[PDB]
Design a protein around this ligand. Structure first.
Ligand SMILES: *[C@@]([C])([C][O])[C@](*)(=O)[C]([C]C1=[C][C]=[C][C]=[C]1)[N]C(=O)[C]([C]C1=[C][N]C2=C1[C]=[C][C]=[C]2)[N]C(=O)[C]([C])[N]C(=O)C1=C([C])C2=C([C]1)[C]=[C][C]=[C]2
Ligand SMILES: [Mg+2]
Lengths: 222, 195, 250, 240, 244, 231, 211, 235
């Protein structure tokens, strides 16, 4: 019997700052226990200061990104080159996903950019369109390894101020881009150690008012 | 849903229907009216799978109300029961059949006679002095077979119904939360507010 | 492409006339004479084989046609229209009756179906009426022998005897004098040949005349034996020799 | 399918087929609607060219769309049946999907929309019908009276008439009907409706039909004798 | 294209009339007269066959009076072929109703359905209307005995007595004169034949030029019987009433 | 006369009058100019207003990053045809990862317009288009007529009084073709070309509309104070 | 999930948790399970996150068109029915929804339960989700009609807490809403971690737990 | 006869040009756009005094930020309004935002030329579409049955259009207040109307960023009429 789905592995990570946002993902592509590519881009600049990554089944992920890029193109044609806001893109993507409710895109999608007040924004999707805005989100194979670490180091969960003994929490101080990239690199280095589908390389896309910038870092190739 | 009963006496038809709605291990409601008035002298009670029941009942109700307006005339209980049966016999060979069993109780103002029809989800129609759907009849039919007379009064029919319900409440494992009782006679349809 | 003539081509004129039907009846009037006579024990239908050329083999062109084993048909008017009507009449006898009831239709109901087809060509979109009048002779168990006329309008009438086409007015008068309710089949054939001779100009013989009967069952024409209830077709087309034999005693 | 554009614009900006549909309405028997303080009355003309008629079974001019709304008309009788059927179906469809009966304004808007659709659809001609739709909204005591026409425009009226000689009865209503103080009772409302038809009808015998609609689905049709009493009283006061 | 040849059958005249409906009515006015009379204890249907021949087989012939079901019959005036199309549709409709509700179809409901079909041909489709006018004679337990008529416009009305086809103006005047409400079937039979005898275009009214039918409660106890008269039975009733 | 009732009818001299009448709608439309060099291609359009309170109707439409057109005639028909081009350009990218050739874009427009000239019921398009673009074989300019005829040109103009601008370009042919690597000078030549078609009115800030595409230049439209530089 | 809603003297209270689950893994803890249809209409989400979200936003648009056409705000009954008929088309196709349509209309406060199975039920008290069974105990024992707005908000909050504690697939935070005749009012996000300890101390409940 | 989609020798669609003649017979509708808002006003034109004028609905809401006034065969506008309302709400569904006034107008105008032998004829009604969005601010559009739409600072359509447009030519400037625009619509309506202008036979409306689209009460309009009379009598 023909199985129309597959698993290409990979893991992605989106973190929102005060005036910036990052979307990171490893560059490894796999089937079962084999490596297809050590460098196969997974995070894309979709236009209008929006970055996107559809992680899971690569063929469905490529199609969704391709359709959303196309949706941005036609949004300009139909609405006088108006800039597509991140919240409007998220809602549009929901309808792309649910249009196949009965033959889903097997992907976990994350988009990142800036909201209409200039603040960093990350949105996460389920394979059939349920979306939510978040400050921090990891998706994919090693999502369960990374997210608890982010709860602890980004939102300061289970962390209290010494001396008070559980009476006063650690205050929610914003993070800088340099501090965030450190958490991203440590997240992926740790995931690479304990997850076999994660490795080879790490490509990070940073979004500011100035534009979309890239950073690449090598990972272990075993 | 669970239990629906019907009994035709001398000058009326009495329908008794359980009040409980259940989803899994939880009772969602304990005051549900499992009936629709099709016309002023015709009442239909129903039971089956969720959604299908109310969708079918209200679909029938709309069709009969449409007929009433168009002709300025109330269809006989026999005509209504035949219409309902055809809709169910049509449904059973459809892509997704209506999973609904019904009782139609009406007073024919032409013949001055009460009439009770039992119709299951396959479109199996039968006119009866008393009837039930599901596991209801299994407990109640022995009492009805014993006590029933065609010359019974409405008050005697209600006492026999209380007896049937008392037996259900004793031997049925499921709690159906009592019944709503409605009487159909020459003066129309009314609800017994204390039972 | 697509058939964009979805509207009627036959319509009522201010006087209440349906023009195309009247014009179709005019085409029938120009057509060669054909007739039908009903006897006590049979029916006869006849017409002239108007050959377009002497090089043409007139045997290949059949003006008298079998519709069912007990029903036959003849026409006056446009030949091609008749030929397609016979094809449809034969088919409808099976689809709307024989495949349902397991037996051939009675004459009146087959006539009714043919009439319906001709009525629809009078009201449906993008078509003209059939330019023919049919005479349909037949037999069935409960109605006995019968003879029907069908016109371009779709109207049909039962006849004791009648004629259509070129010399119908004169032929109908001739039949009124000769017809009675005690005629045997041979008497009806004799009267049919007398009536038809008046409308024919040239040669009058078995090769220029087409004649068929609805009469007794023909077990010799059935093609098989073994089933008592199946006794054969009542429709029979008379041969060239059989016609000439009756022209000597004329 | 037959797709021919029958309703089209002419050089002067007119749709003749819609305007000729109004001429069919002009030919139709007179219909009148008058709303009082707590009721609405629908009056209708019956042409007395047709006697030997069976009045029991002959289609009545006023039709119930639901228990609380009625519809009368002027124009082609056969066309009116199609609109009434559609309206009745929609009334039940509304109850079925929204769990409320239609408002009079909604039902009118639907019927008017159907009429409009037949003025710019291929292969169809406009309805040769104008309607008067009257009734009371659910749980409301304010009388409602609307009018529609072949083009598809609709509007609300304190009192209105349609059909043949409607120009005359409208003239009568414009001077007799006071907005500041409408017919306070049923009697006053019916009397004014009969008076208005007596300007046009001919004889006040079986030529006048009256239908009174009151709040809370209280609809009744008056009989010949009841109407004849109004005809008697009106003319006796007139002899002065 | 094809537009060039379209007659446009479903349009209004400047006066607000439907051309084809009016012309169809003109056609019907040349058809054989059909009369319906309703009495307290039954209904009569009488109709005149058009210029027949001696060689027409009358006993097996039917051009005017048709049976829709056991309770309802119709008299035809116009194109016979067009009428048979509608008659078969009405027969099916009556059976659909009986299958659905398990009761015989009320007369008006059957009449409305046929009249709605006729109406459709005047408003859409681009086809010519049916050149047919019906007189419906029927019975049901709501209104009892009923007479209706329908015409190509799709408009229908109820009657105590009515005529369609040729000479309806003259026929309706004669019916309006002699008709009374307390009338019986035997009297109505006489009225129908006397009216045809005076309005006919033929020299004399004979059995071979007529179709006749009654709907009577004159059936054994509470039930209704349809009687389509035979040629010999029409001959006898003509002698009884004193016409031949 | 008797042969102009529909598009399906040839006249006795072999003419299609409904197509010729559609061609007439273009001549009533406002003037627009097209020209190109080896590196760039330029559209210049004179926009038209209803009155002083009204806006100036847009003439130029973008089809892709490397292609677009200017219109003259029925604007809604230009919206339909430009939408078709947008889809075709888009089909080429999604399926073949290939930018649609300008020549092939012209062939597709020709074939779409043709179907409307041979079938009953429909009508010809009532608009003329000037398509510019930069593809793998360099800069291109096309002229579209709703008869179906599409023509590749160095320069051209369509609309009312377009003959004046067309003559200017025919003289300037040897000069403006050589304007390589200089967008402003190529636009200047276009603005000077469209000026030959003006009478009474002159080029104002909200009147003029310019578009350009080239080697390292995506299809961009200039309106408002962005074209004040060229006035 | 755990969601609840109930009618009372001063309108209708609507409460829900914020946990999203993908097997044993906690996908999110900040999810919104209450949906804003219009200033006078709320909808709850339980079961399929995507299904509930998509169809209720579809309903909200349907309700808005209704307001434009009819110059009148839609009733709670009509809104719930539009949803019910919409999901009934896809019965047996795999949809998973358990929702409550809460609002105030001309009939007063209104509350309907609607699910993908086909049920559409009017009631004064509902709770749907994996934790509904824990929440019902607190509601049924403390629910009255003559309830103050302060006490009613606490009841709905305390009821979610009961479920969040026991049910593994319920927790995170409590979202509160109060629907009045003047429209709905948001009454904040309340972290269960902090709320639990607070309620334990002030109320004295959860004695078996140590803190 | 002749095709519905036929071109004239001048290069115009016969049917579109004929529909424009029907619009000239319609009642007057005026729109004025300012930096404080856009005002829409119409002539009701009741055919009889018994007709309850408040049921005449020639000014219509499309969304909270978009309004619409009509002139011509008003029955034809209902399906256009229905499409506009659907388009506005559908875009809010797909994009979680208000739709641009221009985009809404473009959607309505796409219906215009969908006629042939689709609907059997063009619409016989013109629309003034007024609204506000964040990108282009307060806007006024004139949507025709040709499929063409022009943006306007001020515009009049209907029977007294060319007379009203000439008056709007002189009166409009970029610094107009909302109150000034209200009085200006009333002034020009009073000038072109057959019957005497009052609160019952004329209707005002506006669209502001804060309050959205609002149809004015008859009591509110009556005061603006009284304010107009006094200021004209002041000189
Ligand atoms: C309780 C957690 C139930 O345990 C509650 O009902 C919540 C409600 C809710 C959650 C988020 C937003 C709004 C409301 N439900 C969930 O969190 C559900 C649990 C669930 C998944 N399928 C399902 C559920 C419950 C009942 C029936 C069916 N979570 C989701 O719906 C999310 C997290 N979806 C998925 O994890 C996936 C979906 C959908 C999907 C996946 C994963 C993979 C492939 C196709 C679809
Ligand atoms: Mg690894």
């Amino acid at each position: 019997q023909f199985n129309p789905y597959g698993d290409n592995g990979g893991t992605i990570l989106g973190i929102a700052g005060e005036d910036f946002a990052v979307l990171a993902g490893d560059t490894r592509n796999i089937t079962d226990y084999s490596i297809n590519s050590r460098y196969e881009p997974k995070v894309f600049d979709c236009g209008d200061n929006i970055v996107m990554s559809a992680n899971g089944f690569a063929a469905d992920g490529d199609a969704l990104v391709k359709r959303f890029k196309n949706s941005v193109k036609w949004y300009h044609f139909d609405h006088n080159d108006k800039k597509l806001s991140i919240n409007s893109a998220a809602r549009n993507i929901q309808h792309l996903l649910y249009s196949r409710r009965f033959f889903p895109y097997y992907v976990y999608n994350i988009i990142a950019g800036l909201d209409e007040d200039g603040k960093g924004a990350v949105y996460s999707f389920d394979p059939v369109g349920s979306y939510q805005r978040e400050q921090c989100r990891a998706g994919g194979a090693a999502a369960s390894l990374i997210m608890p670490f982010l709860d602890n180091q980004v939102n300061f969960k289970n962390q209290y101020e010494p001396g008070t003994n559980g009476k006063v929490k650690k205050p929610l101080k914003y993070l800088s881009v340099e501090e965030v990239i450190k958490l991203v690199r440590d997240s992926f280095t740790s995931a690479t150690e304990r997850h076999i589908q994660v490795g080879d390389g790490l490509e990070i896309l940073i979004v500011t008012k100035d534009g979309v910038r890239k950073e690449f870092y090598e990972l272990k190739r075993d | 849903m669970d239990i629906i009963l019907g009994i035709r006496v001398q000058d009326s038809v009495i329908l008794a229907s359980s009040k409980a709605v259940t989803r899994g291990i939880s009772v969602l409601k304990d005051s549900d009216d499992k009936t629709r008035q099709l016309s002023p002298h015709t009442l239909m009670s129903f039971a089956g799978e969720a959604g299908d029941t109310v969708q079918f009942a209200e679909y029938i109700q709309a069709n009969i109300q449409l007929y009433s307006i168009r002709e300025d005339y109330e269809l006989s209980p026999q005509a209504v029961s035949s219409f309902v049966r055809q809709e169910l016999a049509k449904s059973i060979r459809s892509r997704r059949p209506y999973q609904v069993n019904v009782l139609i109780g009406g007073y024919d103002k032409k013949k001055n006679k009460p009439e009770l029809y039992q119709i299951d989800y396959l479109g199996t129609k039968v006119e009866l002095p008393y009837g039930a759907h599901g596991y209801s009849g299994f407990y109640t039919f022995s009492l009805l077979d014993h006590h029933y007379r065609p010359d019974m009064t409405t008050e005697e029919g209600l006492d026999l119904l209380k007896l049937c319900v008392q037996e259900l409440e004793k031997r049925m494992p499921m709690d159906f939360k009592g019944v709503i009782v409605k009487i159909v006679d020459k003066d129309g349809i009314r609800q017994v507010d204390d039972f | 492409m697509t058939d964009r003539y979805s509207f009627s081509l036959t319509t009522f004129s201010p006087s209440g006339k349906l023009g195309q039907i009247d014009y179709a009846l005019t085409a029938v009037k120009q057509g060669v004479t054909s007739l039908g006579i009903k006897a006590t024990n049979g029916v006869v239908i006849a017409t002239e084989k108007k050959s377009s050329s002497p090089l043409a083999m007139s045997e290949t062109l059949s003006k008298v046609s079998l519709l069912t084993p007990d029903i036959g048909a003849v026409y006056s008017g446009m030949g091609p229209d008749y030929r397609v009507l016979v094809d449809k009449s034969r088919k409808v006898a099976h689809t709307s009756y024989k495949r349902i009831y397991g037996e051939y239709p009675p004459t009146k109901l087959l006539v009714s179906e043919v009439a319906k087809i001709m009525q629809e060509a009078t009201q449906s979109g993008g078509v003209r009426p059939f330019g023919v009048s049919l005479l349909i002779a037949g037999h069935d168990e409960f109605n006995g022998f019968s003879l029907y006329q069908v016109d371009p309008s779709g109207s049909y009438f039962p006849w004791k005897a009648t004629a259509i086409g070129k010399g119908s007015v004169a032929a109908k008068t001739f039949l009124e004098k000769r017809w009675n309710d005690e005629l045997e089949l041979e008497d009806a054939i004799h009267i049919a040949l007398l009536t038809l001779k008046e409308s024919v100009e040239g040669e009058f013989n078995g090769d220029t005349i087409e004649l068929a009967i609805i009469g007794d069952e023909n077990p010799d024409l059935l093609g098989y034996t073994g089933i008592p209830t199946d006794k054969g077709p009542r429709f029979r087309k008379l041969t060239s020799q059989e016609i000439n034999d009756r022209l000597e005693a004329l | 399918g037959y797709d021919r554009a029958l309703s089209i614009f002419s050089p002067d900006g007119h749709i003749f087929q819609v305007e000729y549909a109004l001429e069919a309405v002009k030919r139709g028997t007179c219909a009148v609607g008058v709303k009082g303080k707590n009721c609405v009355v629908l009056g209708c003309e019956r042409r007395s060219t047709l006697k030997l008629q069976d009045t029991r079974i002959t289609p009545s001019k006023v039709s119930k769309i639901d228990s609380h709304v009625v519809l009368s008309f002027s124009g082609l009788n056969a066309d009116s049946r199609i609109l009434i059927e559609k309206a009745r179906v929609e009334a039940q469809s509304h109850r079925l999907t929204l769990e409320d009966p239609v408002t009079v304004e909604y039902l009118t808007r639907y019927v008017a929309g159907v009429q409009q659709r037949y003025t710019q659809s291929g292969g169809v001609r406009p309805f040769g019908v104008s309607t008067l739709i009257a009734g009371f909204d659910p749980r409301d005591d304010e009388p409602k009276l609307y009018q529609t026409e072949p083009s598809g425009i609709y509007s609300s009226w304190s009192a209105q008439t349609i059909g043949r000689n409607s120009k005359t009865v409208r003239e009568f209503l414009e001077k007799n009907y006071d907005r500041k103080e409408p017919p306070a009772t049923v009697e006053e409302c019916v009397k004014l409706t009969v008076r208005s038809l007596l300007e046009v009808v001919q004889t006040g015998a079986k030529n006048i039909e009256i239908t009174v609609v009151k709040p809370d689905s209280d609809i009744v049709a008056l009989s010949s004798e009841e109407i004849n009493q109004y005809v008697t009283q009106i003319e006796q006061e007139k002899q002065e | 294209g094809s537009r060039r040849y379209d007659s446009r059958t479903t349009i209004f005249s400047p006066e607000g009339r439907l051309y084809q409906v009016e012309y169809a009515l003109e056609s019907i006015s040349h058809a054989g007269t059909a009369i319906g009379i309703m009495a307290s204890d039954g209904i009569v249907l009488a109709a005149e066959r058009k210029v027949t021949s001696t060689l027409l087989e009358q006993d097996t012939s039917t051009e005017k009076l048709y049976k829709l079901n056991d309770k309802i019959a119709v008299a035809v005036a116009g194109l016979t072929a067009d009428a048979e199309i509608l008659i078969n549709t009405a027969r099916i409709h009556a059976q659909n109703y009986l299958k659905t509700y398990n009761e015989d179809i009320p007369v008006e409901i059957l009449v409305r359905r046929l009249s709605d079909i006729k109406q459709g041909y005047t408003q859409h489709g681009g086809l010519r209307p049916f050149g047919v006018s019906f007189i419906y004679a029927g019975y049901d337990d709501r209104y009892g005995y009923q007479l209706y008529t329908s015409n190509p416009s799709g408009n229908y009305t109820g009657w105590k007595a009515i005529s369609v086809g040729a000479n309806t103006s003259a026929a309706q005047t004669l019916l309006q004169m002699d008709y009374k409400d307390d009338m019986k079937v035997d009297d109505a039979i006489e009225l129908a034949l006397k009216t045809l005898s005076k309005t006919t275009d033929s020299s004399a009214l004979t059995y071979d030029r007529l179709e006749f039918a009654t709907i009577r409660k004159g059936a054994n106890d509470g039930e209704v019987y349809q009687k389509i008269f035979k040629p010999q039975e029409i001959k006898d009733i003509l002698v009884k009433t004193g016409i031949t | 006369n008797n042969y102009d009732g529909d598009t399906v009818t040839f006249s006795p001299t072999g003419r299609l009058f409904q197509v010729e009448y559609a061609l007439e709608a273009i001549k009533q439309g406002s003037v627009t100019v097209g020209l190109r060099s080896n590196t760039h291609a330029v559209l210049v359009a004179l926009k038209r207003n209803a009155d002083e309170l009204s806006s100036y109707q847009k003439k130029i439409i973008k089809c892709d990053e490397h292609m677009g057109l200017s219109l003259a005639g029925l604007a809604p028909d230009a919206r339909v045809l430009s939408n078709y081009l947008r889809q075709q350009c888009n089909y080429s990218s999604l399926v073949f990862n290939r930018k649609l050739a300008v020549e092939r874009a012209g062939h597709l427009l020709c074939d779409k317009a043709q179907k409307n000239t041979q079938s009953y019921g429909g009508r010809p398009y009532g608009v003329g288009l000037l398509i510019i673009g930069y593809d793998k074989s360099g800069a291109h300019l096309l002229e579209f007529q709703p008869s179906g005829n599409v023509t590749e040109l160095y320069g051209t103009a369509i609309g009312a009084r377009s003959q004046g601008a067309k003559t200017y370009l025919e003289r300037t042919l040897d000069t403006f073709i050589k304007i390589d690597g200089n967008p402003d000078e190529l636009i200047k030549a276009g603005v000077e070309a469209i000026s030959q078609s003006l009478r009474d009115e002159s080029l104002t800030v909200d009147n003029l509309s310019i578009a350009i595409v080239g080697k390292d230049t995506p299809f961009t439209i200039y309106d408002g104070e962005a074209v004040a530089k060229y006035i | 999930t755990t969601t609840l809603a109930f009618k009372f003297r001063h309108g209708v209270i609507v409460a829900a948790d914020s946990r999203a689950t993908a097997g044993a893994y906690i996908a999110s803890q900040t999810v919104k399970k209450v949906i804003e249809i219009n200033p006078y209409l709320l909808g709850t989400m339980a079961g399929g996150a995507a299904d509930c979200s998509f169809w209720e936003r579809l309903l909200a648009r349907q309700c808005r068109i209704y307001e434009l056409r009819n110059k009148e705000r839609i009733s709670v009954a009509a809104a719930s029915k539009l949803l019910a008929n919409m999901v009934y088309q896809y019965k047996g196709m795999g949809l998973s929804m358990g929702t409550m349509i809460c609002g105030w209309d001309k009939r007063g406060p209104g509350l309907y339960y609607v699910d993908s199975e086909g049920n559409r039920i009017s009631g004064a008290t509902f709770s749907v989700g994996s934790g509904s069974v824990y929440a019902y105990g607190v509601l049924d024992s403390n629910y009255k009609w003559d309830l103050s707005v302060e006490d009613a908000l606490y009841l709905g909050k305390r009821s979610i807490l009961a479920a969040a504690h026991r049910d593994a697939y319920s927790g995170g935070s409590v979202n509160l809403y109060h629907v009045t005749e003047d429209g709905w009012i948001y009454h904040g996000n309340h972290d269960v971690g902090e709320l639990f300890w607070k309620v334990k101390e002030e109320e004295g409940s959860f004695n078996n737990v140590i803190g | 006869d002749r095709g519905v989609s036929t071109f004239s020798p001048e290069g115009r669609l016969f049917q579109v040009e004929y529909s424009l003649e029907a619009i000239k017979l319609g009642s007057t509708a005026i729109g004025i756009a300012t930096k404080e808002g856009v005002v829409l006003g119409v002539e009701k034109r009741a055919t009889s005094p018994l007709l309850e004028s408040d049921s005449i609905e020639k000014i219509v809401e499309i969304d909270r930020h978009i309004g619409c006034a009509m002139s011509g065969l008003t029955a034809d506008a209902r399906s256009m309004i229905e499409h506009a309302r659907t388009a506005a709400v559908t875009h809010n569904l797909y994009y979680d935002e208000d739709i641009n006034v221009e985009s809404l107008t473009q959607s309505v105008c796409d219906l215009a030329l969908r006629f042939g032998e689709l609907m059997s004829r063009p619409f016989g009604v013109a629309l003034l579409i007024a609204g506000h969005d964040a990108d282009d601010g307060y806007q006024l559009f004139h949507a025709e049955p040709s499929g063409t739409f022009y943006r306007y600072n001020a515009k009049a359509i209907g029977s007294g259009s060319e007379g009203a447009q000439a008056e709007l030519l002189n009166e409009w400037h970029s610094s107009l207040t909302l109150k000034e625009a209200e009085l200006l619509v009333l002034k020009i309506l009073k000038q072109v109307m057959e019957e005497k202008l009052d609160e019952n036979n004329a209707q005002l409306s506006c669209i502001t960023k804060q309050d959205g689209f609002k149809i004015y009460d008859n009591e509110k309009t009556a005061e603006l009429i009284k304010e107009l009379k006094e200021k004209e009598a002041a000189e």
